[PDB]
Ligand binder design. Structure first.
Ligand SMILES: [Mg+2]
Ligand SMILES: [Mg+2]
Ligand SMILES: [Mg+2]
Ligand SMILES: [Mg+2]
Ligand SMILES: [Mg+2]
Ligand SMILES: [Mg+2]
Ligand SMILES: [Mg+2]
Ligand SMILES: [Mg+2]
Ligand SMILES: [Mg+2]
Ligand SMILES: [Mg+2]
Ligand SMILES: [Mg+2]
Ligand SMILES: [Mg+2]
Ligand SMILES: [Mg+2]
Ligand SMILES: [Mg+2]
Ligand SMILES: [Mg+2]
Ligand SMILES: [Mg+2]
Ligand SMILES: [Mg+2]
Ligand SMILES: [Mg+2]
Ligand SMILES: [Mg+2]
Ligand SMILES: [Mg+2]
Ligand SMILES: [Mg+2]
Ligand SMILES: [Mg+2]
Ligand SMILES: [Mg+2]
Ligand SMILES: [Mg+2]
Ligand SMILES: [Mg+2]
Ligand SMILES: [Mg+2]
Ligand SMILES: [Mg+2]
Ligand SMILES: [Mg+2]
Ligand SMILES: [Mg+2]
Ligand SMILES: [Mg+2]
Ligand SMILES: [Mg+2]
Ligand SMILES: [Mg+2]
Ligand SMILES: [Mg+2]
Ligand SMILES: [Mg+2]
Ligand SMILES: [Mg+2]
Ligand SMILES: [Mg+2]
Ligand SMILES: [Mg+2]
Ligand SMILES: [Mg+2]
Ligand SMILES: [Mg+2]
Ligand SMILES: [Mg+2]
Ligand SMILES: [Mg+2]
Ligand SMILES: [Mg+2]
Ligand SMILES: [Mg+2]
Ligand SMILES: [Mg+2]
Ligand SMILES: [Mg+2]
Ligand SMILES: [Mg+2]
Ligand SMILES: [Mg+2]
Ligand SMILES: [Mg+2]
Ligand SMILES: [Mg+2]
Ligand SMILES: [Mg+2]
Ligand SMILES: [Mg+2]
Ligand SMILES: [Mg+2]
Ligand SMILES: [Mg+2]
Ligand SMILES: [Mg+2]
Ligand SMILES: [Mg+2]
Ligand SMILES: [Mg+2]
Ligand SMILES: [Mg+2]
Ligand SMILES: [Mg+2]
Ligand SMILES: [Mg+2]
Ligand SMILES: [Mg+2]
Ligand SMILES: [Mg+2]
Ligand SMILES: [Mg+2]
Ligand SMILES: [Mg+2]
Ligand SMILES: [Mg+2]
Ligand SMILES: [Mg+2]
Ligand SMILES: [Mg+2]
Ligand SMILES: [Mg+2]
Ligand SMILES: [Mg+2]
Ligand SMILES: [Mg+2]
Ligand SMILES: [Mg+2]
Ligand SMILES: [Mg+2]
Ligand SMILES: [Mg+2]
Ligand SMILES: [Mg+2]
Ligand SMILES: [Mg+2]
Ligand SMILES: [Mg+2]
Ligand SMILES: [Mg+2]
Ligand SMILES: [Mg+2]
Ligand SMILES: [Mg+2]
Ligand SMILES: [Mg+2]
Ligand SMILES: [Mg+2]
Ligand SMILES: [Mg+2]
Ligand SMILES: [Mg+2]
Ligand SMILES: [Mg+2]
Ligand SMILES: [Mg+2]
Ligand SMILES: [Mg+2]
Ligand SMILES: [Mg+2]
Ligand SMILES: [Mg+2]
Ligand SMILES: [Mg+2]
Ligand SMILES: [Mg+2]
Ligand SMILES: [Mg+2]
Ligand SMILES: [Mg+2]
Ligand SMILES: [Mg+2]
Ligand SMILES: [Mg+2]
Ligand SMILES: [Mg+2]
Ligand SMILES: [Mg+2]
Ligand SMILES: [Mg+2]
Ligand SMILES: [Mg+2]
Ligand SMILES: [Mg+2]
Ligand SMILES: [Mg+2]
Ligand SMILES: [Mg+2]
Ligand SMILES: [Mg+2]
Ligand SMILES: [Mg+2]
Ligand SMILES: [Mg+2]
Ligand SMILES: [Mg+2]
Ligand SMILES: [Mg+2]
Ligand SMILES: [Mg+2]
Ligand SMILES: [Mg+2]
Ligand SMILES: [Mg+2]
Ligand SMILES: [Mg+2]
Ligand SMILES: [Mg+2]
Ligand SMILES: [Mg+2]
Ligand SMILES: [Mg+2]
Ligand SMILES: [Mg+2]
Ligand SMILES: [Mg+2]
Ligand SMILES: [Mg+2]
Ligand SMILES: [Mg+2]
Ligand SMILES: [Mg+2]
Ligand SMILES: [Mg+2]
Ligand SMILES: [Mg+2]
Ligand SMILES: [Mg+2]
Ligand SMILES: [Mg+2]
Ligand SMILES: [Mg+2]
Ligand SMILES: [Mg+2]
Ligand SMILES: [Mg+2]
Ligand SMILES: [Mg+2]
Ligand SMILES: [Mg+2]
Ligand SMILES: [Mg+2]
Ligand SMILES: [Mg+2]
Ligand SMILES: [Mg+2]
Ligand SMILES: [Mg+2]
Ligand SMILES: [Mg+2]
Ligand SMILES: [Mg+2]
Ligand SMILES: [Zn+2]
Lengths: 12, 204, 140, 174, 37
RNA sequence: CGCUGAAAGCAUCUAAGCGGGAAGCCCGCCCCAAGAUGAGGCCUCCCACGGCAGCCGGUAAGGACCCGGGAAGACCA
RNA sequence: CGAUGUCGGCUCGUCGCAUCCUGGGGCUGAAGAAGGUCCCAAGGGUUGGGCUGUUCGCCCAUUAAAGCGGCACGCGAGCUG
RNA sequence: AAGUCUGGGCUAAGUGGUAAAGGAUGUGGCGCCGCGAAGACAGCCAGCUGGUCGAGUGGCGCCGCGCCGAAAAUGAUCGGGGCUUAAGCCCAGCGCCGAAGCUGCGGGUCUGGG
C-alpha cells in the first residue's frame, strides 16, 4: 500500500 | 381485468373506525366504450374508453368519424383497458366496491432537469473540510483504462418526472356513485387535475 | 475480350421443406442459393441469387446434445447484459430464429450480405404466404 | 446369465399385439402400452411372448433385457395387478380414507391428503397399513414412494412411514 | 457425501457406480458415499 | 433424493423412459420500446385537380406559423 | 522519463466466487435445539461508533451477516490532501 | 478459391476446441491366469461342501480414443456460422484450389558472348 511517490507535485 | 379513466381531484383524510385514513379523491365516471379490440380483428382484447365531454367545435373530421361509428358524443380523452370487456356500453365507478384493491396509473410531477441528488438520491459532496465546488456532484463515473468507458444506464443528472407511474394495491375506501367519485387510500401519482387510470389490482 | 457481366434478371423463387433436415447442413445450401453461386453468370457484387422460402422450420433436426447444450447469446450494452438461450428454448419460442441465425452466419458481412439475408423467408408450420410468387419446390 | 432371451409366459387370457416401437397388453385388469426400441423384435408365440436382439454389441444387449422385463411387467399387470404396502409406525401416527383419497396423520401440525392418480387405488385396513394398487408397476412404485416421502423413517426412532418388509435400522441417541 | 478427486471403495459392501458422466461410490454405510469432483 | 430398469439371472436414479428438487434460471410485476429500415396492427378522415414512379400550379383531410398560457419545460419538445 | 500524478479517505459503482448472511442439499462422533464439514447457489443483503494519515488491526454496542478479491493496489481533466 | 471425394477403423465428450499427480465396471481391441456339464458365477433351500439352475464366470496386465480431477474477475465464442458412419481423430488413396515461387507472351536496364 504505502509506496513512495514517483512524481513530485507542481510549480508555475 | 377491469378499469376506468378518471381525473385526480385532491387529497384528504376521513375517519373510519376511529382511524384517520389518508385518501385521494378520484373522479372516475362515466366512461363510454367507443371501440372494442377483438382477437379476430385486432389480435388482442380490450376496450377503448372515452372520458370527459368535448366541444364538437374542437373535434376534427377523422376524430368525428371515429366517435360516430360508436354513436358517442365527442369526448376529450380516449384510452384503452386491456383484457376487459364490460357488458354495457358505459363504464362507471360502480365496478368498484369499497374494500377492493386497485392499481392507479398517472403522470408523475415533472422536475425538469434534475440533479443527481434529487433524481437518484446520491450523497453529493461534503459541505466543508475542503470540498471544492462539488457539493452536489456525482463523484467518479468510472474506472480507468479498463474498461475505459461509461456503462449504459449510469445514473446521471437529466430530466425527472412527467412519466408514467403506477402505484399498486391501493385500498378502495369508498365510492360515491351519484357523483362519480372514488376514494382511494394513500397517494396517487401526478398533479390535481391529472388524468389517471384505475384498474383492478394485480396483487393477490 | 472482357468477362461477361449479366444485366438484371428475374430472380427465382424457391421452396424448401426443412422438416427432418440437419440444421447446419441445410443452412449451407440455403446460403449458396442466396448468394446465387449455383448460377453460371454469378457476379460477386450484385444480388442475383434466389429468394428462398422455407417451411417447417420448427422441425429442423440436430445431432448430439445440442438441444440442451447449444447456447444462443445476446449482449445488451448494459452491465450484466449477456442473455443465454438454449436451442430447446429458442425452438419453443421462436423456432424460425434457429434456421435464421444459422443462415445469417454463413452469409457475407456487409451491405450486400444483409440484402441477401432479406431474401430468406423462413416459416414455422407447413404453410407460407408467398403463393403469389409461386416458388419452385427444391429437393436439397 | 440372461433376461431378454428368457421367454415371457402369457396367462389365459391376456392379448399381446405388436406394433413398430410399441406393444399393447390387454387383460382382465385393463390395458397398458409398452414403448419398445424399434431395434428390438417382439415375437408372439403360443401362450408366450419373446424378445430378440439383432446383435451382441453393448447398446443392443442392454435394450434386450430391458424390453423383456418391460413387457413381462405389463403382462403381470393386467393379470394379477400390482401393489405395495406401507406400514405406519409411530404413536400419534395413523391413516384413514376420505372418499378415494388418503389422509395421513403423521405428526405435523396438519394432516396431509394424498389424491390417488388415474389407475391407482388406496386401501386402509388397519389405521396403520396402506395399500397402493394398480396395473402399472412403475406408477404403483412411484405413488408408494410419494406416500413414504411425506414422513420418511426416522434414524433414531421407530417412527414414520415404512415400506412393508423394510428393515428398521436405527442409531443411538446420546 | 464426500467429494474428492480420488473416489475409492472403502469396504467390501461399497460399489462404484457411474451415473450422468460422474463416478459415484454408493454403499450401505452412508459415510462411504462418494462423488468424484 | 427417488420410480421403473437392463448391460451384469443379483444389484444399479440411467444405458430406454418417468418423478421430486433452490432466495438462483425462464415467464409473471413495474417502466421504455416498430429507426423492430424485420420500419407491425386496428378505427376514422380526404380523394379520384389544372399544365408541358419526373417537374410545376392551386387545394382536400389535416398540419405549421403567430398569440394567451401551463404542477410541461434550459432552448426545443 | 519532448511526464502513464503517486498511499489513505470521500463519491460513484461494476464484476468474480475460493459464499459472510439469506435459499436448497449430503455426511455427522446429527436425540431436540444448536454446531461441525463438504456440495449447489452470485438474487438481494452485508450496521453505527473509539484509536491511528492509515490500508490493516485491536476495541465498544448491535446484527441474519458484520465475506474475500478484481477493475492502472477501480475512480485527483470527480473532490480531499 | 477448390471434395458435403473414395475405402478401413475409433470417439459420444461438442472430446475435437487449453493443464498434472491421481481416481474410475466409459468404450473398443489385445494377452495372461483362476474356477466350471464330475454342474462353476448369480439368484432361490443348507450348513468354505451340499440341493434346481444350466451355462460360462472371476481376477491380473497391455494398447487406441475418451471421463473426472478443472475456481477470477466488462459479453460471449473452436476466427465465426455451424459440425457427430463428422465439417472430429488414426491409416490408405485420387482429384482440385492456392504466392509477387515456376511457365507462357511483351518490354527495360546492366553484364557476358556473338
Ligand atoms: Mg389481449
Ligand atoms: Mg392476448
Ligand atoms: Mg399479443
Ligand atoms: Mg381476456
Ligand atoms: Mg438545485
Ligand atoms: Mg433537491
Ligand atoms: Mg428520487
Ligand atoms: Mg434520502
Ligand atoms: Mg453523505
Ligand atoms: Mg450532504
Ligand atoms: Mg459526504
Ligand atoms: Mg483547496
Ligand atoms: Mg463551496
Ligand atoms: Mg474498452
Ligand atoms: Mg438509459
Ligand atoms: Mg440517469
Ligand atoms: Mg418529460
Ligand atoms: Mg401498466
Ligand atoms: Mg397492504
Ligand atoms: Mg398487504
Ligand atoms: Mg366509509
Ligand atoms: Mg394516460
Ligand atoms: Mg446429419
Ligand atoms: Mg439437408
Ligand atoms: Mg445446390
Ligand atoms: Mg438426424
Ligand atoms: Mg439434444
Ligand atoms: Mg457494462
Ligand atoms: Mg441484468
Ligand atoms: Mg459476467
Ligand atoms: Mg439482459
Ligand atoms: Mg428454424
Ligand atoms: Mg436374441
Ligand atoms: Mg423394491
Ligand atoms: Mg422409495
Ligand atoms: Mg418422491
Ligand atoms: Mg422397495
Ligand atoms: Mg450410544
Ligand atoms: Mg472428503
Ligand atoms: Mg467432500
Ligand atoms: Mg483415500
Ligand atoms: Mg476394499
Ligand atoms: Mg440429474
Ligand atoms: Mg447398495
Ligand atoms: Mg428397485
Ligand atoms: Mg428387478
Ligand atoms: Mg430383475
Ligand atoms: Mg435416460
Ligand atoms: Mg450414453
Ligand atoms: Mg425431473
Ligand atoms: Mg424472499
Ligand atoms: Mg407504452
Ligand atoms: Mg412504424
Ligand atoms: Mg408503439
Ligand atoms: Mg436487426
Ligand atoms: Mg415495409
Ligand atoms: Mg405503423
Ligand atoms: Mg398485431
Ligand atoms: Mg381507434
Ligand atoms: Mg377533389
Ligand atoms: Mg372529381
Ligand atoms: Mg393531375
Ligand atoms: Mg395533360
Ligand atoms: Mg384549411
Ligand atoms: Mg413543470
Ligand atoms: Mg413558455
Ligand atoms: Mg418555438
Ligand atoms: Mg517516466
Ligand atoms: Mg505532457
Ligand atoms: Mg499527458
Ligand atoms: Mg469515513
Ligand atoms: Mg471525506
Ligand atoms: Mg463524509
Ligand atoms: Mg466492473
Ligand atoms: Mg459489491
Ligand atoms: Mg466466470
Ligand atoms: Mg458470469
Ligand atoms: Mg461453488
Ligand atoms: Mg474452496
Ligand atoms: Mg472453504
Ligand atoms: Mg446458506
Ligand atoms: Mg441453510
Ligand atoms: Mg446448512
Ligand atoms: Mg449432539
Ligand atoms: Mg438439527
Ligand atoms: Mg445433542
Ligand atoms: Mg473436509
Ligand atoms: Mg449441513
Ligand atoms: Mg472451512
Ligand atoms: Mg449473491
Ligand atoms: Mg459482490
Ligand atoms: Mg462505521
Ligand atoms: Mg469506520
Ligand atoms: Mg472523542
Ligand atoms: Mg474512525
Ligand atoms: Mg483521530
Ligand atoms: Mg483505521
Ligand atoms: Mg496497524
Ligand atoms: Mg443463526
Ligand atoms: Mg466495522
Ligand atoms: Mg469488496
Ligand atoms: Mg468492489
Ligand atoms: Mg496491484
Ligand atoms: Mg484498494
Ligand atoms: Mg488507486
Ligand atoms: Mg488514476
Ligand atoms: Mg487534484
Ligand atoms: Mg488521491
Ligand atoms: Mg483520472
Ligand atoms: Mg485523465
Ligand atoms: Mg464529481
Ligand atoms: Mg501536508
Ligand atoms: Mg463424405
Ligand atoms: Mg463432460
Ligand atoms: Mg468444443
Ligand atoms: Mg472442452
Ligand atoms: Mg508430472
Ligand atoms: Mg493422465
Ligand atoms: Mg482399481
Ligand atoms: Mg474394458
Ligand atoms: Mg482403456
Ligand atoms: Mg449356487
Ligand atoms: Mg459343513
Ligand atoms: Mg470438463
Ligand atoms: Mg462455478
Ligand atoms: Mg479457416
Ligand atoms: Mg470415412
Ligand atoms: Mg498467380
Ligand atoms: Mg520471378
Ligand atoms: Mg522473357
Ligand atoms: Mg549486373
Ligand atoms: Mg561485342
Ligand atoms: Zn462401504
Amino acid at each position: 500500500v504505502d509506496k513512495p511517490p514517483y512524481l513530485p507535485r507542481p510549480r508555475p | 381485468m377491469k378499469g376506468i379513466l378518471g381525473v385526480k381531484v385532491g387529497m384528504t383524510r376521513i375517519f373510519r373506525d376511529d382511524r384517520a385514513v389518508p385518501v385521494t379523491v378520484i373522479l372516475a365516471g362515466p366512461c363510454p366504450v367507443v371501440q372494442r379490440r377483438t382477437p379476430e380483428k385486432d389480435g388482442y382484447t380490450a376496450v377503448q374508453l372515452g372520458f370527459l365531454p368535448q366541444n364538437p367545435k374542437r373535434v376534427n373530421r377523422p376524430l368525428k368519424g371515429h366517435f360516430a361509428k360508436a354513436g358517442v358524443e365527442p369526448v376529450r380523452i380516449l384510452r384503452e383497458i386491456r383484457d376487459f370487456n364490460p357488458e354495457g356500453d358505459t363504464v362507471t365507478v360502480e365496478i368498484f366496491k369499497p374494500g377492493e384493491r386497485v392499481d392507479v396509473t398517472g403522470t408523475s410531477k415533472g422536475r425538469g432537469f434534475a440533479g443527481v441528488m434529487k433524481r437518484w438520491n446520491f450523497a453529493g459532496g461534503p459541505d466543508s473540510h475542503g470540498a471544492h465546488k462539488i457539493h452536489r456532484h456525482p463523484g467518479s463515473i468510472g474506472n480507468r483504462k479498463t474498461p475505459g468507458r461509461v456503462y449504459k444506464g449510469k445514473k446521471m443528472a437529466g430530466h425527472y418526472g412527467a412519466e408514467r407511474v403506477t402505484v399498486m394495491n391501493l385500498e378502495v375506501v369508498d365510492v360515491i356513485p351519484e357523483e362519480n367519485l372514488l376514494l382511494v387510500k394513500g397517494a396517487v401519482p401526478g398533479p390535481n387535475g391529472g388524468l389517471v387510470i384505475v384498474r383492478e389490482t394485480k396483487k393477490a | 475480350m472482357k468477362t461477361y457481366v449479366p444485366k438484371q434478371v428475374e430472380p427465382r423463387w424457391v421452396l424448401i421443406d426443412a422438416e427432418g433436415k440437419t440444421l447446419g447442413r441445410l443452412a449451407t445450401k440455403i446460403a449458396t442459393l442466396l448468394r446465387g453461386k449455383h448460377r453460371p453468370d454469378w457476379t460477386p457484387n450484385v444480388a442475383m441469387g434466389d429468394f428462398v422460402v422455407v417451411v417447417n422450420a420448427d422441425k429442423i433436426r440436430v445431432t448430439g446434445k445440442k438441444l440442451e447444450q447449444k447456447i444462443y447469446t445476446r449482449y445488451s450494452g448494459y452491465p450484466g447484459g449477456l442473455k443465454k438461450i438454449p436451442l430447446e428454448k429458442m425452438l419453443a419460442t421462436h423456432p424460425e430464429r434457429v434456421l435464421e441465425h444459422a443462415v445469417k452466419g454463413m452469409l457475407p458481412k456487409g451491405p450486400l450480405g444483409r440484402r441477401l439475408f432479406k431474401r430468406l423467408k423462413v416459416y414455422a408450420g407447413p404453410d407460407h404466404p408467398h403463393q403469389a410468387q409461386r416458388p419452385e419446390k427444391l429437393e436439397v | 446369465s440372461r433376461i431378454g432371451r428368457l421367454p415371457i409366459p402369457v396367462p389365459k387370457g391376456v392379448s399381446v399385439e405388436v406394433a413398430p416401437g410399441r406393444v399393447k397388453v390387454k387383460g382382465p385388469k385393463g390395458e397398458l402400452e409398452v414403448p419398445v426400441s424399434p431395434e428390438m423384435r417382439v415375437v408372439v408365440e403360443e401362450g408366450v411372448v419373446r424378445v430378440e436382439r439383432p446383435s451382441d454389441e453393448r447398446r443392443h444387449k442392454s435394450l434386450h433385457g430391458l424390453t423383456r422385463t418391460l413387457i413381462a411387467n405389463a403382462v403381470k399387470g393386467v393379470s394379477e395387478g400390482y401393489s405395495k404396502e406401507l406400514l405406519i409406525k409411530g404413536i400419534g401416527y395413523r391413516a384413514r380414507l376420505v372418499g378415494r383419497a388418503l389422509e395421513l396423520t403423521v405428526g405435523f401440525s396438519h394432516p396431509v391428503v394424498v389424491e390417488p392418480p388415474e389407475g391407482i387405488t388406496f386401501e386402509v385396513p388397519e389405521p396403520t397399513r396402506v395399500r397402493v394398487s394398480g396395473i402399472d408397476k412403475q406408477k404403483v412404485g412411484q405413488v408408494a414412494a410419494n406416500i413414504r416421502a411425506i414422513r420418511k423413517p426416522s434414524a433414531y426412532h421407530e417412527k414414520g412411514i415404512y415400506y412393508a418388509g423394510e428393515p428398521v435400522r436405527l442409531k443411538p441417541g446420546k | 457425501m464426500k467429494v474428492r478427486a480420488s473416489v475409492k471403495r472403502i469396504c467390501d459392501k461399497c460399489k462404484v457406480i457411474r451415473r450422468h458422466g460422474r463416478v459415484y461410490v454408493i454403499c450401505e454405510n452412508p459415510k462411504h458415499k462418494q462423488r468424484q469432483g
